[PDB]
Scaffold this active site. Sequence first.
Site, short mmCIF file in Angstrom:
data_model
loop_
_atom_site.label_atom_id
_atom_site.label_comp_id
_atom_site.label_asym_id
_atom_site.label_seq_id
_atom_site.Cartn_x
_atom_site.Cartn_y
_atom_site.Cartn_z
CG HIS A 104 -1.80 -1.24 1.31
ND1 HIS A 104 -1.33 -2.31 2.04
CD2 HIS A 104 -3.02 -1.60 0.85
CE1 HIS A 104 -2.22 -3.29 2.02
NE2 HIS A 104 -3.25 -2.88 1.30
CG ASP A 205 35.82 -31.49 15.32
OD1 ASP A 205 36.91 -32.10 15.36
OD2 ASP A 205 34.75 -32.04 14.95
CG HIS A 208 36.83 -32.23 11.75
ND1 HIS A 208 37.21 -31.06 12.38
CD2 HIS A 208 36.43 -31.88 10.51
CE1 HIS A 208 37.06 -30.05 11.54
NE2 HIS A 208 36.58 -30.52 10.40
CG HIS A 213 38.83 -31.16 6.25
ND1 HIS A 213 37.84 -30.78 5.36
CD2 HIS A 213 38.43 -30.73 7.47
CE1 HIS A 213 36.89 -30.14 6.02
NE2 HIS A 213 37.22 -30.10 7.30
CG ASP A 362 33.59 -30.13 7.36
OD1 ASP A 362 34.01 -30.83 8.30
OD2 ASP A 362 34.23 -29.17 6.88
C1 LIG Z 1 37.18 -26.44 12.23
C2 LIG Z 1 37.81 -26.28 11.08
C3 LIG Z 1 39.29 -26.15 11.07
C4 LIG Z 1 39.97 -26.06 9.86
C5 LIG Z 1 41.35 -25.93 9.84
C6 LIG Z 1 42.06 -25.90 11.04
C7 LIG Z 1 41.38 -25.99 12.25
C8 LIG Z 1 39.99 -26.12 12.26
S1 FES Z 2 1.81 -0.55 3.17
FE1 FES Z 2 0.30 -2.08 3.59
S2 FES Z 2 1.44 -3.90 4.04
FE2 FES Z 2 2.93 -2.33 3.75
FE LIG Z 3 35.84 -29.56 8.66
#
Ligand SMILES: C=Cc1ccccc1
Ligand code: FES
Ligand SMILES: [Fe+3]
Lengths: 446, 446, 446, 192, 192, 192
Positions: A104, A205, A208, A213, A362
């Site tokens: 509107h 982590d 992992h 990786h 991952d």
């Molecule tokens: C969590 C991802 C990661 C990637 C590279 C080094 C350390 C951590």
């Molecule tokens: S002007 Fe009416 S919903 Fe935004």
């Molecule tokens: Fe990772």
Amino acid sequence: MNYNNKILVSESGLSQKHLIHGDEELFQHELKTIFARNWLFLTHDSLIPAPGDYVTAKMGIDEVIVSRQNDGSIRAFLNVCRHRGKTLVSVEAGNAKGFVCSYHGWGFGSNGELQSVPFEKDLYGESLNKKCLGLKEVARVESFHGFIYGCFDQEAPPLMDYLGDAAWYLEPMFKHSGGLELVGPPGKVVIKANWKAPAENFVGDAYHVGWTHASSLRSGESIFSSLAGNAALPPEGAGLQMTSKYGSGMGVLWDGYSGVHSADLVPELMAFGGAKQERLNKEIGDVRARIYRSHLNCTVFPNNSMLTCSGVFKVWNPIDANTTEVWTYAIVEKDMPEDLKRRLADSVQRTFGPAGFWESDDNDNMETASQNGKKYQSRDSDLLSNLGFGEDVYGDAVYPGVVGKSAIGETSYRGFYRAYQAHVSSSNWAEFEHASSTWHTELTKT
Amino acid sequence: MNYNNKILVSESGLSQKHLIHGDEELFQHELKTIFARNWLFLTHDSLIPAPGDYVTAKMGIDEVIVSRQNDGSIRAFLNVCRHRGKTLVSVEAGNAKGFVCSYHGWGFGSNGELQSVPFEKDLYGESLNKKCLGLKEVARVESFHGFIYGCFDQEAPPLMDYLGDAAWYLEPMFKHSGGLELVGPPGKVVIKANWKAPAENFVGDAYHVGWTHASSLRSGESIFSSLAGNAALPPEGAGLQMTSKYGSGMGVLWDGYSGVHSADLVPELMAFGGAKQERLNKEIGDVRARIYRSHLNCTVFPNNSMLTCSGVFKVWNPIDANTTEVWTYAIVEKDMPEDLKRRLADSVQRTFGPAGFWESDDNDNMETASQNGKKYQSRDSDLLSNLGFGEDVYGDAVYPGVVGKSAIGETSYRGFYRAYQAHVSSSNWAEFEHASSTWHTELTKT
Amino acid sequence: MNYNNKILVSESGLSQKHLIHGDEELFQHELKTIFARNWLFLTHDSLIPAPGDYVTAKMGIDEVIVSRQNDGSIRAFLNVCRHRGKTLVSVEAGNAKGFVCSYHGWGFGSNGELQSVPFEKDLYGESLNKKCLGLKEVARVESFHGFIYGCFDQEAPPLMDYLGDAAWYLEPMFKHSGGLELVGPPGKVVIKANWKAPAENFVGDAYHVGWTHASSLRSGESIFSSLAGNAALPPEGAGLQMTSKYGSGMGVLWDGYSGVHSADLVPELMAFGGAKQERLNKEIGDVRARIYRSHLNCTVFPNNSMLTCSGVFKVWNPIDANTTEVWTYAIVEKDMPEDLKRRLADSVQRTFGPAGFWESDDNDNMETASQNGKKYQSRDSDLLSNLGFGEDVYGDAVYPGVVGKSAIGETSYRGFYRAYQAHVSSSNWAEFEHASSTWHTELTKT
Amino acid sequence: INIQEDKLVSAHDAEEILRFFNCHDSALQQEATTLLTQEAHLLDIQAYRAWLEHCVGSEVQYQVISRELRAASERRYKLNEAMNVYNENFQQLKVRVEHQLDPQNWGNSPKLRFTRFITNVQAAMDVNDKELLHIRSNVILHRARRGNQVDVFYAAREDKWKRGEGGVRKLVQRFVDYPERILQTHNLMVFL
Amino acid sequence: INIQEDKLVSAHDAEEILRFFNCHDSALQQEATTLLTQEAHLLDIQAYRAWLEHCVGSEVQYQVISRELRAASERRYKLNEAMNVYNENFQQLKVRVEHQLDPQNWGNSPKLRFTRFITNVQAAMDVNDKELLHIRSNVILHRARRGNQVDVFYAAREDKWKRGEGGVRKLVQRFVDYPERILQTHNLMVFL
Amino acid sequence: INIQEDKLVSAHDAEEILRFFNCHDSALQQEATTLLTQEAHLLDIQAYRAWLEHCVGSEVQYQVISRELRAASERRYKLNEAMNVYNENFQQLKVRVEHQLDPQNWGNSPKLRFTRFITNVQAAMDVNDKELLHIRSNVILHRARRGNQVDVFYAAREDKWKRGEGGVRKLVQRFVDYPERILQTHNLMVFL
Ligand SMILES: C=Cc1ccccc1
Ligand code: FES
Ligand SMILES: [Fe+3]
Ligand SMILES: C=Cc1ccccc1
Ligand SMILES: C=Cc1ccccc1
Ligand code: FES
Ligand code: FES
Ligand SMILES: [Fe+3]
Ligand SMILES: [Fe+3]
């Protein structure tokens, strides 16, 4: 489920019920006790530097407009018209003095004020109280060295206090380097994982990396590459882990300034970081100058993560318990040569963007760990985060926070989930504080 | 909904509330009271014959790894890592001495034991109690003549007792034929039906065959083909129906050894089955030898079905109240010539597989009957299964179980739903038993 | 949520909680208190004129078969077999004396009676009580000048009384014009909006036209075209708004007989409507003859809308809180030349059909306003409908109902939502009546 | 292609590549395109009898397999790798065609709608049988029915076509290894 | 095309149209079709080394961008309009290929299934570099894995191909502006 | 095709088959492919004015129908079988083009992204009007907007093209019978 009583995270953060990655009722509860309560990443100064510049951002499942004001400040507002609730802004970034609703035609200022209503005099006369019809404003908006966070809860601690002990680790790169810029626009991809799966992975982590990786380490030739296929454990003193009262935490991998970047960037980066480190020794001391050029894998609670030096910057935007929209930006140091910034940004996306080959490693881990949280026989099962428990310290003379003095462990998982449980079982910040008055003691038991 | 009190199935199994095919809360309740409590089909000896052979299978919405042990036994485990809950195995079948998680590299044995943790000494020291970190094991795994079933509930009756009166009918084909083999891999297709729709159809629905399958009967020239378009009712004594205490049941169509197989297999099959029957007369008597070569449409409660002689073997894997993942294998007699086994397997898939033209006839029936269970005006409506009621017997001198001595009726629906209601309203096996102490009397009233 | 107590719509209908467009529990509650209780559009005489003619229609989320009986009456039945609940009819329209179920072959008459059961004598004997197995019948089916509505609730007011004050406005076009025909088949499209978003827009939203439809107004050259981009406000006395006890309402735009039709139809239509108006002056008086050829944007509560003169006829069929299946028919005057009827029907679809360029302008408005109702920070926010409040009248000497004597306002929103709230908080028609005994006083306050 | 170096490539796939890299015949690729387009047209309009009469050889094997998911490193487990979703001779195709055309096939009312998209056509004559034409092509098959049911199929097709009655080239083998292990299309009751 | 009149058309898109409207060479369109079909075949069977060896020039830039959503009327905001999902030289493509082939790429077991559909091929020689071939084509890319994961990608590709070693035409530039801003396919880890 | 035997085939579809089975002209199929590829390119880049100017004849009928679902055995019910989603003359197409280009068409900001895939092209000259070219082709049309909205359309197109101003072949009729009865794409606001 009674969130006051239900033990979703065990004492000392040692384990979590698997249902936390799958339960939709808990997801809805998190919208209130996690996302509406805590600080969430919005944007960077570098993306909205001039008056009128704006971007859209998610805060939880809500969308906000984040706008640079004429006075140089930043304000953020729900992207929802105050009339019949239409979404006001349909683009991701731009520059405007205001926003007009396509339904509107109501016109709101960059300051959120209702400034114009079509044919107001003829239709509403003097009866429309526009002063009370401003866009719903995000109560708190603060900056950490250009990085702009928002919080819907007026009662939240200041952003700096909220970062707690994590701030000390971020400062060498975020402040003492001369400052960072965020390179946009971000990559955006939906994954079928709970937001907590990547958040926990980035917060703590390192375990992992060598296995998950393996292929990326072997193929890219990066500096952490000796880890490929768990061929080699990092030496003693290769790094540490930390966590903090309000849930933020990170791993520190000493000296890893070229991070995940493939060999084509390693010499240039290692030269650049070392040169700045040599200058920083005189300013902030040897340890902190070394932290500047050390690889930090960090989550700023709840759902903002980053790899410093690698330059990866992430928002894990929640959609439902098994759906997350991943935003990926690159961070660069302002005083890097422009050509290096460009190549670094491309490399961040190459490794961790929508077609990031590292990030792809991952996918299955996060998605299946999340989806299994819905499966009947797994809901009440215990996800383990006990690695390194009983060896963490607090109040160390050099490294602040709850700290595990080893490169690989689950210290930061425990602090993340301790804070998570304290929020989920609390109705407000005062209750979180009460639930957290012995936070470091709980984490360092045994 | 209060499952202790709610009458979802009326006395004698005469009707069921239509909502049972659509209600998601009830589906969630079934995960507990049906799927976590009862025996579910996993695999066959023929698919994992050697030590180290494994397959994945669903049990309800859970996934399990089913592995042949060195000692010749079979054990099954949740396909979920005990560390951070990642799915352990991503393939459907193979041979391995163990399974390594792709997240942090934890190594589990084929016996479910946590055997290795990367860098355990350096990281966990002696503090990780691997003995307590074995994969979550399926409590009960038993075999019925090579067919392997699992049950999460340690309190379940032995599989043989669970089959109850149905076992007597299955034995001529499953045991006295010399044994069956399952031909894999199965076809896998998702249909938009509740798992109970095909389960009820296979357990006791001969009525639908002439009309639903009119086109397949007319086109394929199979031996049940006189039924096409309800052109002809099977003669008196063409067959019977049975059901049992724990819910399993079947129809028996006398002599129908070539089943749904198109005319290209009829002479060979009718010769083979008749030849074996002539030998079996001397061993198990005329009636049971005849049952061997008679077409049985059976559901082993809750969600495993089959057509003996046709050789169709089904798992109706539940996904949600209107979603089911259909697994289709072929069963063959071990002593059939190999070329016949191959052609029989192809014919099973031709008729009832992913592109099974017979199975396709059933799609709209199952999907719409299920989806209508969500519709407001139908939720509280009554699905009827009263055909043949008041003519069933129990304790017959020749044919055991609750038996309707007619080829077409709803005897097996009533026994299936009687058992279903007893489970849904019970918290454990003891309560089911108490709720079932007059099961056959209830079914034979009037 | 406690629907007895929860204020979803504020006093006088001045505002509504945004959650009403997003809340699935409320959607489920609406199936009971809105769709199972009120009159819903089924079809027109012109689509089922002969005995045996039938169509399928939605009533809420339920599907019904609507059939012309031999005696000339119309009866409607759930499209669900009384045996095992299969969908009976899979087509949208046809002619038949009955419907046979494709599952087990049960045969129902056009009158809903169970007429035949395959092999009934051999199978059921005399035990099947077919008299009690007729299709579940829609309790109430009534006609408003050929337009056929159904209601599942036997207690509903007659359709004429239900239309209340809106009937007076519809009669010149629906009755005194000689009668209308519905041109089928309808266009059918799914939009990601709550059914209330288009219902509220058609019932009372003239404000949006100049801005939302700026491009369509500018491009099509229609007679409301001066509004494009809010370039011009309609003069004083350009029209009015009305609403009624049971929720139906409309806007009246004086003389707008060619409606949204592009310039290629304007002269012909303006000639035709004016000619009939001149005849009608003598019959129903000048005012009502003028109403005949005036553009009415109307919603017949809850989910049937129309633009008279434009000839657009809509059903907003509910699927879930953010999903609606839009049915679009054309209405034409029976005595129009056939070539004009054909071109008018095409023009209705051109502007408001599946590829209607006008209707496309509304998509984002309806979809985002609806989806925002799920967003955490917006659920408890207030959608405003206060335009014109305090200037409405009741009991006017010329124009009946609650009337705002201006072309643009929110009078009809208020009456729509007043009725909505009264139904949602009531368990039956008696309670709605009690909740509505001062309906017009509530709407005309201040 | 050396499959010892290109570790992800199967022996079968490497053999099929070799077929088309060699004698590239432009006119043959165009004949193949015409053949497949006309076949797809007949199928789309549900002219199943015409398809059999004009497109399908009496000696046809029409085969669509579903391969069990196995470890890339798997070397010991040697049981049946695939099942046949289709494995039809001409008579079996005829049965399926009659099933489609039967007036009591309730699933075919209201009439289905098919749209096929054929791409990536390659053609090469067999080395040893100069009358055997190898044709490879990919198909997207869209099936719509009953208002809101929509199923889309995706596949690569390895065909052999040979001149039959009247000199008309007809399908004598179609092989499809269906790429999705678990079908999300209700069934695979379409002729790929 | 006059972009002042055709208000929705970008300068870049108008330039690319002009390229193909001019000297239409039928034989060139057919060569291009063959080139792209063979490239897609190599990719579909995951012969990534063969793809590099046979299809990709040493000087390649392989680029896929994601453009930020901005107002059609926007004229002031001038920061980075796009990010690079891919922006690879030959060595960077080689890294990605090695990552695909690594036996510890756990995501590739069980083996993925790829099916590509290449359409709308257009070809034109560059005006100034008579050895540079411009090829435009659209791709639908279907990736299936792990039973029930299905991802479908859609894109237009602006390529430059040039004769390299042995006279073989190879890709020296691919540019894709990916049409979906937020990916709903888990990742974009496919070679468009 | 004998529609008495091939029970599922409509009279209209059988007539259209006959058209293309007869005089197959290879060069004509290639001209048609070029025509449709260029048309699709203009549409994809949203050059709607250029599309009208270059591709659309002044006498055009541009028609897309939606057919009501009826019983395959239905013989009595004879009311309007279909509605027109589109049934446009040139002026009506121009209205739609202006609506697309209007700077107050809010739905077009941020700019939409279109990708079209044209396949299965067949071409044949009319028997009686040697200047009328019949072209059949199938389209997959991908429309992406606003981050995460993705709509995919599928259709067969029966076209007539005729030489107009400057000898340029232009569309004089397009007929599409849309295969999905209930649209699941928000609207059909795309030019098929
Ligand atoms: C969590 C991802 C990661 C990637 C590279 C080094 C350390 C951590
Ligand atoms: S002007 Fe009416 S919903 Fe935004
Ligand atoms: Fe990772
Ligand atoms: C339930 C399916 C069936 C199929 C053939 C014979 C009997 C039963
Ligand atoms: C609500 C739609 C509308 C369209 C034209 C005129 C008035 C109202
Ligand atoms: S989740 Fe399996 S090793 Fe960590
Ligand atoms: S479900 Fe209709 S006859 Fe059985
Ligand atoms: Fe059946
Ligand atoms: Fe509108």
